């Protein structure tokens, strides 16, 4: 059974750490930080890792009931699974699948439906993933909303993420921090069952990042969001689950007009990409271009300079 | 090469007419109205129809610059491509790909980044797809918002859909109208290049609907949203593009525990599903079950009663 990556241009694909389209390809040194994202983690032979799931529209969503915190505009959400069933914290995963894997304040809307009469309500809401009340592994988080009396108890409530905000009083672009993992269990304990951090081991190589720009909803947020794998690649690897003939798959980025190769790269079995380049660089690509698996290569294969 | 459908449970798949997951399966008589959605339309041999595109996060989103309308809290948006390039009306499609294909008020958030200093802003917004200002084919739509003086001109603005609303002063669930196509060019002319309407032509058959519940943001909306194909099926068919051996593909819905078949259905080459049943029915399915392609059959194959 032959390994493949889907024939999809960068802009046709979807970011795996936030429900938004990919925009561009970026590479740079990653020594000054720990690249350990938990969403968008999948092996080429079809093993989902960390908190990665299949649905691109369920990333950074939250479902459950809410209870008002007296004298505030905040609500505690007791988390439920996507199918509105009881969340199970004993499962061997870092957090509920699709849980945000970066520290920062995410804004969207809390919506709610009253089961008895079909009445509905919706409000802007913010969740702080670096907050002490952000404890999804324990099954509980907190929102700041625009209301203080509207949301009802014991009723299905959903949070739909839109973008990220930033306290404009602090240094510009100081949040969100996309390479800092939240403490899924808050102050209670350390993170568990994490997908491993990644780094280029072969000299002269850097990680290839699939970049999007998260929408900003307030302040001066850092809107860069990089993932190791497009969500479609995750979905594809899970379905196909083809055997890896090696630890490294040689991909060629190709222009379908002529077949000419813009550059080549290494897709690692454990699920990330490296290129042969040194320095920060926004890759300039033909809009119709796409990745093409050509062969399995030795782990210590020397790429052509990007 | 062989035709297939993805191995995904219903709840693991995404509604193709709105960026939310699927929840259940439904069948009902559809004579009293015209079923002609333009999103979630694809042939089994891989031809996209209507306004259908590949990414599920792009359904019912809008990108462009906005202009305030004197004396109101409304804004006109001059539409752009997903990649912020100029939108082209002359392309032979009904509207920009991903455009809402029902009539009703969709509520979400308008966010905006100021190119110069990186400042951002966000407000609740509703687009009324049934009114005259909804002219996406012409490259212009209009939003009702919370703000009055906060959005800037000449700046990248995005609309992120969340749910739908309804006026409680009227009969409950009287909007939205999911089977009523909006006029993509307003009153300037009729819709063009539409995907054809679908109706069971075989005696004893009804359409099978992939049903989701849209979030409600105000009032008592009708939150049923039905598509003819999951978004993953669309993505799959587009990639695979296997030749159709006949106009009808037989599918079995199986429980992977035992391989036991719950029901069979017809996946028509033009991209929709029928079952053998009369009357409205919510299909009771095991949550691990999925569709499996078994064989190409004669057009006039008689399904077993579901």
């Amino acid at each position: 059974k032959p390994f493949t990556v889907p024939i999809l241009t960068v802009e046709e694909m979807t970011n795996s750490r936030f429900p938004i389209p990919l925009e561009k390809l970026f590479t740079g040194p990653s020594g000054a930080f720990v690249v350990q994202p938990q969403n968008g983690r999948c092996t080429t032979d079809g093993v989902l890792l960390g908190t990665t799931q299949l649905s691109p529209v369920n990333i950074c969503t939250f479902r459950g009931d809410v209870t008002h915190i007296a004298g505030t505009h905040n609500y505690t959400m007791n988390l439920a699974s996507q199918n509105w069933n009881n969340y199970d914290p004993t499962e061997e995963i870092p957090a509920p699948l699709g849980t945000p894997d970066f520290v920062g304040r995410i804004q969207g809307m809390l919506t709610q439906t009253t089961r008895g009469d079909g009445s509905t309500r919706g409000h802007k809401a913010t969740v702080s993933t670096g907050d002490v009340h952000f404890t999804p592994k324990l099954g509980s988080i907190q929102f700041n909303t625009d209301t203080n009396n509207d949301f009802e108890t014991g009723q299905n409530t959903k949070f739909t993420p839109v973008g990220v905000v930033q306290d404009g009083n602090g240094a510009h672009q100081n949040e969100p921090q996309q390479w800092v993992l939240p403490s899924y269990s808050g102050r209670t304990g350390h993170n568990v069952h994490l997908a491993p951090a990644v780094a280029p081991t072969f000299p002269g190589e850097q990680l290839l990042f699939f970049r999007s720009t998260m929408p900003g909803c307030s302040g001066y947020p850092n809107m860069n969001l990089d993932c190791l794998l497009p969500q479609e690649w995750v979905q594809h690897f899970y379905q196909e689950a083809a055997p890896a003939q090696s630890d490294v798959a040689l991909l060629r980025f190709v222009n379908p007009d002529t077949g000419r190769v813009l550059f080549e790269c290494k897709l690692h079995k454990s699920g990330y990409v490296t290129v042969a380049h040194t320095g920060q660089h926004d890759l300039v690509i033909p809009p119709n271009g796409y990745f093409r698996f050509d062969s399995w290569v030795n782990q210590f294969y020397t790429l052509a300079p990007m | 090469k062989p035709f297939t459908v993805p191995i995904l449970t219903v709840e693991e798949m995404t509604n193709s007419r709105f960026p939310i997951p699927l929840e259940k399966l439904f069948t009902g008589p559809s004579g009293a109205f015209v079923v002609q959605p333009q999103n979630g339309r694809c042939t089994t041999d891989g031809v996209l129809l209507g306004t259908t595109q590949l990414s599920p996060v792009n359904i019912c989103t809008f990108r462009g610059d906005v202009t305030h309308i004197a004396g109101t809290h409304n804004y006109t948006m001059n539409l752009a491509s997903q990649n912020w390039n100029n939108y082209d009306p002359t392309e032979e499609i009904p509207a920009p790909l991903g455009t809402p294909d029902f009539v009703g008020r969709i509520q979400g958030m308008l966010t905006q980044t100021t190119r110069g200093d990186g400042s951002t802003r966000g407000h609740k917004a509703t687009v009324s797809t049934g009114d005259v200002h909804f002219t996406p084919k012409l490259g212009s739509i209009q939003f009702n918002t919370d703000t009055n003086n906060d959005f800037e001109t000449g700046q990248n603005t995005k609309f992120t859909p969340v749910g739908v609303v309804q006026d409680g002063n009227g009969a409950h669930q009287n909007e939205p109208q999911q089977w009523v196509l909006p006029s993509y060019s307003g009153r300037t002319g009729h819709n063009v290049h539409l995907a054809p309407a679908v109706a069971p032509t075989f005696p004893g058959e009804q359409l099978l609907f992939f049903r989701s519940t849209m979030p409600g943001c105000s009032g008592y909306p009708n939150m049923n949203l039905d598509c003819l194909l999951p978004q993953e099926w669309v993505q799959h068919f587009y990639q695979e593009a296997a030749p159709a051996q006949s106009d009808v593909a037989l599918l079995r819905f199986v429980n992977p525990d035992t391989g036991r078949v719950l029901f069979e259905c017809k996946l028509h080459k033009s991209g929709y599903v029928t079952v053998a049943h009369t009357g409205q029915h919510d299909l009771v399915i095991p949550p691990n079950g999925y569709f499996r392609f078994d064989s190409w059959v004669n057009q006039f194959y008689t399904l077993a009663p579901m």
Partner: antibody
Amino acid sequence: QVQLVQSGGGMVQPGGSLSLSCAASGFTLSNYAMTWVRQAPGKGLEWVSSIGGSGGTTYYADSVKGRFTISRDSSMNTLYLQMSNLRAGDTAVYYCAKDKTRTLRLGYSGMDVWGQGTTVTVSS
Amino acid sequence: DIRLTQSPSSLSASVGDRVTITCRASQSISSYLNWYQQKPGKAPDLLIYGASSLQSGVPSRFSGSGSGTDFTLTISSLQPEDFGNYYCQQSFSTPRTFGQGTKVELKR
């Protein structure tokens, strides 16, 4: 405490049928590929049958194709092996085993958790 | 049917000795090779998976190497509890196959 407990087995005349069970604890069985491995008296290990993860699908050694049926029950978190038209070459200790990693169908990892084994004897 | 052939079929060694068991495949199985230890009357125990990864709970003295067709289980310092039968197993493709096994006994 991840664990596989086996039941069933015993002896049966040649041509007869037997059923093996394997109840899982501490993990959801339907999420991992499950395998039946057998060992004849004084012999090595032989692969009998596997079922995939959440997507299922089944696989068989030619020896037992058409005679054996592997299946599971998610509501009981149990794996089953149905054997019929049994012959002397089926006399062995039968083990159920779980794949390390979760997959859609049949994966490529080793088997990290094992049942204690059930004895099957086919004799007149 | 991918055939796996272990070498040797049996060995004996003193405590502290370096023990090497090789497995050769009839065709390339990439790195999808696993090693098991079986005590008599007991279920096998996963030692090495993916040719070179140490299963948790397994002592550091066990180690694996190789890819394609040729693989090696190595015990850096043989211990009395390491007695038993060792099986290599490929999971590259169905039918899943085992080596004929290797008997490891201790001298004293």
